[PDB]
Scaffold this active site. Structure first.
Site, PDB file in Angstrom:
ATOM      1  N   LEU A 247       1.039  -1.045  -0.001  1.00  0.00           N
ATOM      2  CA  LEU A 247       0.132   0.125  -0.075  1.00  0.00           C
ATOM      3  C   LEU A 247       0.934   0.921   0.082  1.00  0.00           C
ATOM      4  N   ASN A 248       0.450   2.512  -0.350  1.00  0.00           N
ATOM      5  CA  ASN A 248       0.939   3.577  -0.523  1.00  0.00           C
ATOM      6  C   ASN A 248       0.190   4.903  -0.130  1.00  0.00           C
TER       7      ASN A 248
ATOM      8  N   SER B 287       0.471   7.397  -2.146  1.00  0.00           N
ATOM      9  CA  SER B 287       0.351   7.738  -3.455  1.00  0.00           C
ATOM     10  C   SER B 287      -0.538   7.141  -4.183  1.00  0.00           C
ATOM     11  CB  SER B 287       1.877   7.439  -4.233  1.00  0.00           C
ATOM     12  N   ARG B 288      -0.987   5.702  -4.013  1.00  0.00           N
ATOM     13  CA  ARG B 288      -1.982   5.268  -4.934  1.00  0.00           C
ATOM     14  C   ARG B 288      -2.469   3.948  -3.899  1.00  0.00           C
ATOM     15  N   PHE B 289      -3.696   3.474  -4.043  1.00  0.00           N
ATOM     16  CA  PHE B 289      -4.515   2.537  -3.576  1.00  0.00           C
ATOM     17  C   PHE B 289      -3.812   1.304  -3.301  1.00  0.00           C
ATOM     18  N   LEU B 290      -3.891   0.590  -2.158  1.00  0.00           N
ATOM     19  CA  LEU B 290      -3.428  -0.797  -1.706  1.00  0.00           C
ATOM     20  C   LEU B 290      -3.341  -1.876  -2.809  1.00  0.00           C
ATOM     21  N   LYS B 291      -2.550  -2.643  -3.094  1.00  0.00           N
ATOM     22  CA  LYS B 291      -2.812  -3.766  -3.997  1.00  0.00           C
ATOM     23  C   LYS B 291      -2.140  -4.997  -3.337  1.00  0.00           C
ATOM     24  N   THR B 292      -2.648  -6.148  -3.799  1.00  0.00           N
ATOM     25  CA  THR B 292      -2.217  -7.613  -3.466  1.00  0.00           C
ATOM     26  C   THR B 292      -1.601  -8.444  -4.385  1.00  0.00           C
TER      27      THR B 292
ATOM     28  N   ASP C 268       5.145   5.103 -16.601  1.00  0.00           N
ATOM     29  CA  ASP C 268       4.958   4.089 -15.835  1.00  0.00           C
ATOM     30  C   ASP C 268       6.079   4.298 -14.593  1.00  0.00           C
TER      31      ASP C 268
END
Lengths: 783, 1224
Positions: B24-25, B27-32, B138
């Protein structure tokens, strides 16, 4: 012999070659000796030795100019007889091993003079361009000093003779005339040629069948890197040469100690393992750094095992809680099990509560047991039939109650593992005193009692009819209870049972057809008991034992969540018993009582003169609610519904049907908390107080749990390692999920606050999205 | 399962493996992270839920960008599957499990100077290509680049706790979300992020911090860490948009002019790697295939690729064999060495790509993997200390890895040999104990599966013992290097001394393993001990090993005495102290004189070896005094050993007299005169071998009697007395010359030696003779081994088989395509359909009156007459004018219409004709040299049959022989197996042309001594041809072995009219008209070599001596025929009945093979007929006699044919006057 096409790996053994004839150059003695001539004064001047031609064979490899095959040489007869041998010879390289790239070579070494014997050289190809090895057939060759080879003309005729061996269509009279063709091949001796600097040789290597050749097969298994390669490099970096061991210290020692403070089930990296390898001093210093350092190294060769096992008894005695980490099947080391048994030599009352995991250890106790079984069979071959295991045996023989617990635990494992059935007899032999054995037989009659219950469950009748029949059966059982002497109680090993009240017994209306009977103990008090058959209760039993152990862990924090540790156990493979409790259905409490308030005010109504508040009953109810929520979140027990949840008038919240757990729910996977809309409302109106208090108890239970969670993690690791109902290869992911719900990787406790926020969203949806509102409506509909 | 596409885990929206990590950050939303697995094989995917994504689902542009980016397979990582379903919208990518920075920390060994620059260069090229793809932005993180066994960096669009790389533009320009601005980005941001990421990769730690961003806002930073590199990085670092990073400009600003081209070729090789890098997406076996293929192609291209940058002439490859061909291209593995690490890297060559290809070669997809790993070991040619350690470490791992194929040990020994060819001083002090442990690991790996041959590896390692001593010298080099400092010379000396004392144990273990392999019995190890003895110079230890080899030589003298010879010959290379053992070695030579002749030659080699360097004069003087006396043997090697006596005498006068005492040469002067002496010493050992046989016979006799009329001479005294009368006659059976008067007393010692050779076995008129040797089988045992292989049961097929799976078997499939086929297909292809054989009972009983007379062509006789069998027989006859005529049977039978029903113009004179068996085709040959076959065309209408047209199916000119030869006689046949034809040339040469291909299969020629061919006939199996001779001989030849089986003659020895194989007589008997005059037909059984039945016209029985088979006769016989009119005739035999036209009385005769008695003539004279009856003079031979006792007018019959009308049987005949007739 048969011809057939058979590929490299398909073909089996090593090559062989028979070699026979040659071509006399006639320039010398017929052995190609000394170069005879009338000028022989020069032969004395040139010191020309008389050489008797012999031969040698070795194969040039692949035309890759490497060396593979074996040089080989035979005995000596006249080469002036032109050395006609037809002599077979061979070497050690199979056809499966033989690379289709390969070539034969030969060197004819004569025997000439003082330190003198000649040398001639030749080479050729092994298989065909059609892959058949020399067509597995007869041939003839020619060779010069270099760059020379073989052809087929009269050798092509001889190759047709090999076509007689190659099984062209043939008949019996043709065979007799093939004896006449032995006369014809005899006539073939007429050949003549007189070349120089080169020679011919007749060499037949006819086989049965035409070879074929290819590469060897292979196995891809478990565009990628792999595990064993990393092992290779890492092990290549494992030198550790100069043996002098320094004893340095610095501020990094604290960080390293923190690195050694990681969870037992974790898999350490490379640099960390080496840092722990040079940490041996401090590793011996800290008692919590023992098991971690033990897993930080891999014992295979006796080299590492030397210093390891030497430091095993040298290092400080580890905590018994951390000893459960190295007591798993993950470490099968003999010195490990030994030293652990020496540390586990002390058996407390918590060992009796650890007997559940000790059954798992018993299931995992067998590793390469063929030797031990043969050792026992060696002493069992005399009389006819009619290791920490010694520590378990001594502990079983010590206290009769512990022995009864071991036998009862063996009763369940007897079904899964056939060796446990005889291990029960070995346990009976482990206990010398037969005083406990009599009560063990009296308790063995309970199997026949369960068989009687199953006999009552065999016939199908009306609800009331089966009830009256259960009453009559309860009377017939009441006769036997008074007839037989007192035995050990299922609830506790200390308490003894006297009799049972026939008219006080009840019957479950469920499909399992459970039996509820109130039995008067030797303490002259009625004890309600609910038993079931035809099912495996091991799930809910182990879950109950885990609930009791966790309750002990909470009691260690000097705070009680007021959770009732319902006693549950498995008598037979299909049979089980449990201590009954004043439990009422949630739907029944909702419909009949019309809210939980009146039901709680039924037993002990409390109306305060101020707020109309309720006492320790409601307090214990709330604590039980929050505790059950924490348990449901942590353990991840599934299949919990309004039916699976019961209400205990003692002020306790009962939860049953633990069969589905570790992230397994009947419907789609819901949140962690098992709290419904009703309890959320009851605690919702009181939220200003009740929610803050329940959150306090929540966080407190979280700290308490997560503090000692390591031992429970190791115990769960061993238990899951043994075997599980409703879970199989779940186990790795199950351990993982336990860690995630525990959030051991996070030093922040805010996760519990997030769960609290979710509980806050349980009453009203946040409505971030339409699908989110539909999800909240789905969770509400599921309940 | 209640519903599909679901999942067990909460966050998991579909079927996959267990859970995983996440992030998670701010800067941006959490990811798994997620993993989807195929039962133990998973990739690296990302969790996304489509179920809750139905509210937005703006994945279009992202899917287009994903398709465009992952579509190409550059050095950067490409996404596997990007997709959205009704349940899971999760994305996917190939399995990596290695971050760039994380692997930088994890792989300190794989990390190198030029390596990081190479990876950074690849990243620069990928980024530049992305910038050329008009797409960028990117986010750059240290988890973006992944590594594999190929050790290459691959960047992915998804770079997902770690320090983020901010875009200065998007940061400074951000106010309230830039006034609600949509998605925006530039190549500049990717240039700055790529910059910071590159610095993070360079140092290992990044520059990203809040204070760092604040400093970026402060427009100043402290630079601490190359000039050009720092400037090029600072260009992108200072201001992304403003300072003009220009990734392409930096790509053109690349420092190395060499490195650019090398990494260009390595970029092409990276495209090859991409080819290796490449529901249903991709196959699982496709990975292994791509791997093996990548490797094979890697080497095949590594030839020219090596040739490109920093090559050498000599190598171990084929192109390397061509390169070493210029530089002079026993058995040892050697190539171009390192030469002090490429002369201290004069060309500055450092390449980790070879180690990368080796780490990729760690896997194995076939046995081509052997050449792959070997090619890696060749790639090890570049010399680097730290690299050589890991490279050599891989080799032993490969050794202990595959126990499947034995080739693994060989390849491991090769790579180890390369490691021995490395030749570098120890860089690390660990190199000593690490080698000591390396030996132990190889010892642990030395224990393996049975029947495998480790002998070669033993000889190799033993040969590498010197390299081990060199490793000890490398330890001494480490000590010397550590002695360079102050107060550390004595310390390093003592350390080297203690390490040497500890190395003594390692040497003890090595010697122990050596003695173990030597004691192992697997005689190949003994031969492997030869190289061990050669390299044994490194071991100065005791003679105990030589004693173990001596006991081994005794145990070899027991069983493996042939191998004992070869070992002892090699054992003469000892060259060690304590010469007292050389006496026992001489006794071992006397013991080597026991049996094996190879041991004699070996002892001669040891004799010359001892002749080179002597030890004690007197002992060797007496030794050679006996040995030279025993050197008089006539064996080729014995002479060579006898020649050493002169060389011995060189090393004086007293010895000259002492030698002159036993000297057999009166005229001897010097070495040359000694050669003349040996020339006068010529003798034969054959009678000596026979004498040895007499010695063994005496050993089998009774020596019990000591009567007449133990010291050294007592043996001879007991040897002479052993026999009296027998040895005398045996002495009379030899040459018995004055030169044969030599006693050769050494043959008594060799007699007791051969008595020991007989002591290795059981107890040694007259009974069966005793052979001196026995033959090996190797024949039936091979077939039995084929039966064991049948127990293994590989495949095979006689007929056509289905297409085999692709692979190296394609050579076998091409081999199946290398064999001519469709012989049978030519049968059903063209020339109409195929009829069947319809037979009839014996026709000889019928009256046979002639019901028809018809002549189409008066002018000339028909050269051939044949009939096509069936329900309605097709009559056919040729012409001397070259005309083909065909008439209808039934039509001539009923309506009696007499003309040619069909007429074909040959335009040239016809030779002969025959009807193809079970076919409607008619074959014909013409004296113009024209061979052709006409297919029949007919129809059936109005309850009858009619003919349509005659056309030649195939046309083959016999004039194409080149000598312009005319076809004499023609006979064709069709076997169910295959069909063909055979004909006789104008020179009477047998030529068999394949009917299928219309080409000549083979050409046979009868010997000119037989004159010309008197007839033509084919065997029942048709593998043999039966032909008569104009010389009056009979010749049967086997076409199988392509030779002449036999040549027979009999009777008056005149010309043979005809020859054929009778039915009832079988293939074992042949009927031949010819030979004796009076005899009409001579039937003789081929195998029996006698004439069983001879039908002769005469009033008396012939002569038995004259009728006897003629064999011993030769080609010298002058041809004598008969000009009488009774000579030429025609005969046709079928169905147990043999019909013969008699030109004598001009009548048709019929001889029934069933009863020659009942046999009689079809048509005869008006007045009376003839009475015939047989008898038997000989048990093996019978003879039939014919005793004799006019409207019809016809000339001699040139042709006749038997036929069936499907109603009643009948015969047709064509005369020399051109007239035809039929009799039923």
């Amino acid at each position: 012999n048969n011809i057939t096409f058979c590929v490299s790996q398909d073909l089996d053994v090593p090559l062989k070659v028979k070699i026979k004839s040659l071509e006399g150059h006639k320039p010398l003695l017929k052995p190609s000796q000394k170069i005879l001539n009338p000028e022989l004064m020069l032969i004395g001047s040139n010191v020309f030795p008389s050489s008797d031609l012999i031969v040698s064979l070795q194969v040039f490899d692949k035309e890759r100019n490497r060396n593979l095959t074996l040089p080989i040489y035979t005995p000596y007869i006249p080469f002036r007889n032109s050395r006609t041998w037809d002599y077979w010879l061979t070497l050690p390289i199979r056809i499966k091993q033989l690379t289709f790239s390969s070539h034969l070579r030969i060197i004819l070494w004569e025997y000439n003079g003082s330190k003198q014997i000649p040398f001639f050289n030749l080479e050729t190809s092994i298989f065909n361009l059609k892959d058949c090895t020399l067509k597995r057939g007869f041939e003839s060759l020619k060779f010069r000093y270099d760059v020379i080879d073989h052809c087929e003309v009269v050798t092509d005729n001889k190759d047709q003779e090999n076509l007689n061996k190659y099984f062209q269509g043939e008949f019996t009279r043709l065979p007799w005339l093939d004896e006449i063709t032995i006369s014809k091949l005899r006539k073939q001796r007429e050949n003549r040629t007189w070349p120089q600097g080169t020679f011919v040789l007749n060499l037949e290597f006819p086989m049965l069948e035409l070879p074929v050749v290819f590469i060897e097969r292979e196995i891809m298994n478990t565009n990628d890197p792999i595990e064993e390669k990393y092992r290779r490099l890492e092990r290549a970096s494992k030198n550790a040469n100069l043996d002098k061991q320094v004893k340095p210290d610095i501020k990094k020692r604290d960080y390293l100690n923190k690195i050694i403070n990681y969870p037992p089930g974790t898999k350490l990296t490379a640099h960390e393992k080496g840092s722990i390898w040079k940490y041996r001093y401090y590793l011996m210093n800290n008692k919590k750094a023992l098991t971690k350092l033990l897993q930080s190294t891999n014992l295979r060769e006796e080299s590492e095992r030397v210093e390891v096992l030497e430091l095993m008894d040298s290092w400080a005695e580890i905590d018994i809680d951390d000893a459960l980490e190295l007591l798993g099947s993950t470490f099968k080391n003999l010195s490990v099990r030994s030293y652990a048994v020496n540390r586990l030599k002390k058996a407390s009352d918590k060992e009796l509560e650890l007997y559940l995991l000790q059954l798992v250890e018993a299931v995992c106790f067998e590793n390469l047991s063929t030797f031990s079984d043969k050792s026992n069979s060696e002493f069992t071959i005399v009389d006819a039939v009619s290791p920490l295991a010694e520590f378990l045996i001594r502990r079983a023989l010590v206290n009769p109650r512990l022995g009864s617990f071991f036998y009862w635990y063996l009763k369940s494992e007897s079904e899964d593992k056939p060796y446990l059935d005889q291990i029960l007899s070995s346990f009976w032999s482990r206990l010398d005193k037969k005083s406990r054995n009599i009560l063990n037989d009296q308790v063995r009659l309970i199997n026949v009692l369960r068989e009687c219950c199953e006999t009552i469950k065999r016939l199908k009748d009306t609800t009331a009819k089966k009830m009256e029949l259960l009453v009559h059966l309860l009377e017939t059982k009441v006769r036997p209870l008074v007839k037989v002497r007192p035995i050990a109680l299922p609830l506790d090993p200390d308490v003894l049972i006297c009799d049972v009240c026939p008219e006080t017994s009840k019957v479950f209306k469920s499909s399992l057809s459970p039996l509820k009977i109130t039995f008067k103990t030797t303490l002259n008090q009625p004890y309600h008991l609910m038993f079931k058959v035809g099912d495996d209760l091991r799930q809910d039993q182990l879950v109950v034992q885990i609930i009791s152990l966790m309750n002990e862990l909470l009691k260690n924090e000097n705070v009680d969540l007021k959770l009732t540790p319902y006693k549950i156990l498995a008598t037979g493979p299909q049979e089980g018993a449990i201590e009954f409790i004043p439990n009422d259905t949630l739907a029944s409490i909702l419909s009949k009582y019309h809210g939980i308030l009146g039901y709680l005010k039924l037993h002990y109504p409390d109306e305060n003169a101020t707020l109309g508040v309720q006492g320790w009953v409601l307090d214990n109810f709330v604590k039980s609610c929050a505790g059950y929520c924490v348990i449901t979140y942590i353990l991840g027990v599934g299949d919990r519904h309004l039916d699976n949840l019961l209400v205990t008038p003692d002020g306790h919240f009962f939860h049953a049907d633990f069969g589905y757990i570790l992230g397994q729910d009947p419907k789609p996977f819901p949140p962690l908390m098992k709290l419904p809309p009703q309890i959320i409302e009851a605690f919702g109106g009181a939220e200003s107080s009740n929610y803050d208090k329940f959150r306090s108890y929540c966080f407190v239970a979280y700290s308490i749990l997560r503090r000692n969670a390591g031992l429970i993690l190791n115990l769960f690791e061993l238990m899951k390692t043994s075997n599980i109902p409703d879970i199989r290869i779940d186990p790795n992911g199950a351990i993982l999920r336990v860690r995630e719900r525990f959030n051991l990787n996070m030093s922040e406790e805010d996760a519990t606050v997030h769960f609290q926020n979710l509980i806050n969203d349980s009453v009203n949806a946040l409505l971030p999205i339409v699908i989110d509102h539909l999800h909240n409506l789905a969770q509400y509909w599921r309940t | 399962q209640a519903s599909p596409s679901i999942a067990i885990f909460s966050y998991i929206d579909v079927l996959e493996e267990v859970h995983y990590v996440s992030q998670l950050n701010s800067s941006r939303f959490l990811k798994t992270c997620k993993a989807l697995d195929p039962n133990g094989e998973i990739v690296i995917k990302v969790f996304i839920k489509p179920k809750d994504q139905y509210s937005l689902r703006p994945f279009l542009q992202r899917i287009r960008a994903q398709s465009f980016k992952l579509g190409q397979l550059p050095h950067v990582l490409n996404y596997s599957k990007l997709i959205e379903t009704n349940r899971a919208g999760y994305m996917i990518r190939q399995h990596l499990k290695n971050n760039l920075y994380d692997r930088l920390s994890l792989r300190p060994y794989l990390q190198d100077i030029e390596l990081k620059f190479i990876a950074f260069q690849l990243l620069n090229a990928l980024k530049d290509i992305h910038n050329l793809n008009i797409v960028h932005g990117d986010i750059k993180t240290e988890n973006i680049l992944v590594t594999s066994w190929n050790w290459c960096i691959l960047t992915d669009f998804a770079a997902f706790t770690c320090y983020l790389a901010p875009e200065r533009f998007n940061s400074k320009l951000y106010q309230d979300g830039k006034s609600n601005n949509g998605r925006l980005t530039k190549e500049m941001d990717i240039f700055s992020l790529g910059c910071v990421i590159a610095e993070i990769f360079a140092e290992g730690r990044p520059i990203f911090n809040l204070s760092q961003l604040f400093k970026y806002k402060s427009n100043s930073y402290d630079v601490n860490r190359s000039t050009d590199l720092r400037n090029l990085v600072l260009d992108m670092i200072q201001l992304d948009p403003s300072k003009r990073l220009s990734c392409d400009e930096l790509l053109n600003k690349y420092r190395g002019i060499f490195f650019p081209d090398y990494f260009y070729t390595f970029i092409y090789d990276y495209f090859r790697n991409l080819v290796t890098m490449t529901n249903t997406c991709t196959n699982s076996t496709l990975e292994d295939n791509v791997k093996l293929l990548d490797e094979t192609t890697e080497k095949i291209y590594r030839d020219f690729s090596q040739i490109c940058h920093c090559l050498d002439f000599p190598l171990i490859k084929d192109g390397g064999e061509i390169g070493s061909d210029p530089p002079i291209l026993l058995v040892l593995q050697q190539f171009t060495k390192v030469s002090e690490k490429i002369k201290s890297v004069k060309e500055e060559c450092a390449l980790l790509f070879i180690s990368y290809l080796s780490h990729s070669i760690r896997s194995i997809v076939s046995t081509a993997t052997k050449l792959k790993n070997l090619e890696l070991l060749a790639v090890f040619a570049q010399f680097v200390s730290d690299e050589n350690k890991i490279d050599r470490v891989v080799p032993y791992f490969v050794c202990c890895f595959e126990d499947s194929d034995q080739d693994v040990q060989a390849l491991s020994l090769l790579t180890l040999i390369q490691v021995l060819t490395s030749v570098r001083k120890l860089n690390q002090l660990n190199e000593n104990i690490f080698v000591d442990y390396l030996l132990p690991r190889l010892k642990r790996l030395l224990i393996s599966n049975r029947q495998n041959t480790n002998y070669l590896r033993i000889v190799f390692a033993n040969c590498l013992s010197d390299l081990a001593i060199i490793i000890n010298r490398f330890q001494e080099f480490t000590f010397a290097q550590h002695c360079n400092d102050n107060s550390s010379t004595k310390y390093s000396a003592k350390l080297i001394q203690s390490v040497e004392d500890l190395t003594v144990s390692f040497l003890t273990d090595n010697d122990t393993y050596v003695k173990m392999a030597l004691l192992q019995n697997r005689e190949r190890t003994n031969d492997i001990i030869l190289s061990h003895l050669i390299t044994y110079l490194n071991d100065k230890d005791p003679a105990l090993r030589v004693s173990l080899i001596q006991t081994i030589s005794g145990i070899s003298i027991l069983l493996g005495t042939v191998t004992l010879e070869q070992y002892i010959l090699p054992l003469l290379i000892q060259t060690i102290t304590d010469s007292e053992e050389l006496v026992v070695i001489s006794v071992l030579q006397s013991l080597k004189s026991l049996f094996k002749t190879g041991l004699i030659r070996k002892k001669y080699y040891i004799d010359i070896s001892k002749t080179t360097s002597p030890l004690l004069l007197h002992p060797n003087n007496w030794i050679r005094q006996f040995t030279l006396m025993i050197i008089i043997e006539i064996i080729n090697k014995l002479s060579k050993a006898e020649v050493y006596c002169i060389l011995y005498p060189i090393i004086v006068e007293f010895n000259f007299k002492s030698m002159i005492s036993c000297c057999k040469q009166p005229v001897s002067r010097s070495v040359y005169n000694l050669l003349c002496s040996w020339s006068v010493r010529a003798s034969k050992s054959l009678f000596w071998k026979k004498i040895i046989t007499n010695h063994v016979d005496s050993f089998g006799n009774n020596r019990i009697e000591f009567i007449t009329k133990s010291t050294v001479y007592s043996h001879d005294n007991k040897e002479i007395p052993l026999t009296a009368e027998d040895r005398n006659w045996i002495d009379k059976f030899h040459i018995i010359g004055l030169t044969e008067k030599d006693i050769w007393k050494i043959v008594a010692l060799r007699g007791y030696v051969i008595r020991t050779a007989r002591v290795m076995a059981a107890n040694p008129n007259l009974k069966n003779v005793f052979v001196q040797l026995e033959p090996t089988s190797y024949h039936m045992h091979s077939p039995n081994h084929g039966l064991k292989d049948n127990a293994n049961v590989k495949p095979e097929r006689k007929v056509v088989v289905s297409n085999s799976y692709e692979g190296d078997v394609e050579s076998i499939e091409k081999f199946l395509s290398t064999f001519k086929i469709l012989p049978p297909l030519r049968d059903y292809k063209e020339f109409g359909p195929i009829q069947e054989i319809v037979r009839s009972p014996n026709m000889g009983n019928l009256r046979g009156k002639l019901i028809a007379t018809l002549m189409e062509n008066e002018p000339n006789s028909i050269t051939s007459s044949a009939v096509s069998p069936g329900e309605t027989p097709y009559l056919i006859t040729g012409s001397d004018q070259g005309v083909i005529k065909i008439w209808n049977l039934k039509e001539i039978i009923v309506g009696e219409v007499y003309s040619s029903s069909l007429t074909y113009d040959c335009s040239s004179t016809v030779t002969q004709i025959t009807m193809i068996p079970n076919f409607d085709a008619f074959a014909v040959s013409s004296k113009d040299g024209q061979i052709i076959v006409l297919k029949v065309n007919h129809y059936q209408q109005e309850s009858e049959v009619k003919f349509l047209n005659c056309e030649c199916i195939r046309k083959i000119n016999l004039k194409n022989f080149g000598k312009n030869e005319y076809a004499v006689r023609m006979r064709a046949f069709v076997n169910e197996e295959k069909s063909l034809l055979v004909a006789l040339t104008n020179l009477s040469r047998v030529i068999i042309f394949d009917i299928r291909t219309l080409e000549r299969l083979q050409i046979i020629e009868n010997s000119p001594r037989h004159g010309a061919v008197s007839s033509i006939c084919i065997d029942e199996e048709c593998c043999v041809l039966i032909l008569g001779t104009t010389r009056g001989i009979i010749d049967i030849w086997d076409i199988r072995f392509n030779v002449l089986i036999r040549s027979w003659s009999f009777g008056d020895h005149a010309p043979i009219t005809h020859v054929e194989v009778c039915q009832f007589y079988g293939k074992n008997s042949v009927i031949v008209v010819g030979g004796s005059s009076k005899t009409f037909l001579t039937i003789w059984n081929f195998v029996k070599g006698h004439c069983q039945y001879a039908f002769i016209n005469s009033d008396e029985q012939p002569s038995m001596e004259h009728f006897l088979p003629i064999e011993k006769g030769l080609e010298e016989l002058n041809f004598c025929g008969i000009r009488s009119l009774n000579a030429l005739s025609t005969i046709s035999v079928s169905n147990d009945k043999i019909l013969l036209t008699d030109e004598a009385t001009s009548s048709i005769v019929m001889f029934s093979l069933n009863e020659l008695s009942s046999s009689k003539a079809v048509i005869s004279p008006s007045r009376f007929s003839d009475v015939f009856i047989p008898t038997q003079v000989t048990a093996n031979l019978t003879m039939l006699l014919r005793k004799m006792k006019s409207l019809y007018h016809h000339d001699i019959i040139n042709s006749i044919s038997t036929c069936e009308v499907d109603e009643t049987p009948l015969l047709v005949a064509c005369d020399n006057s051109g007239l035809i007739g039929i009799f039923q």
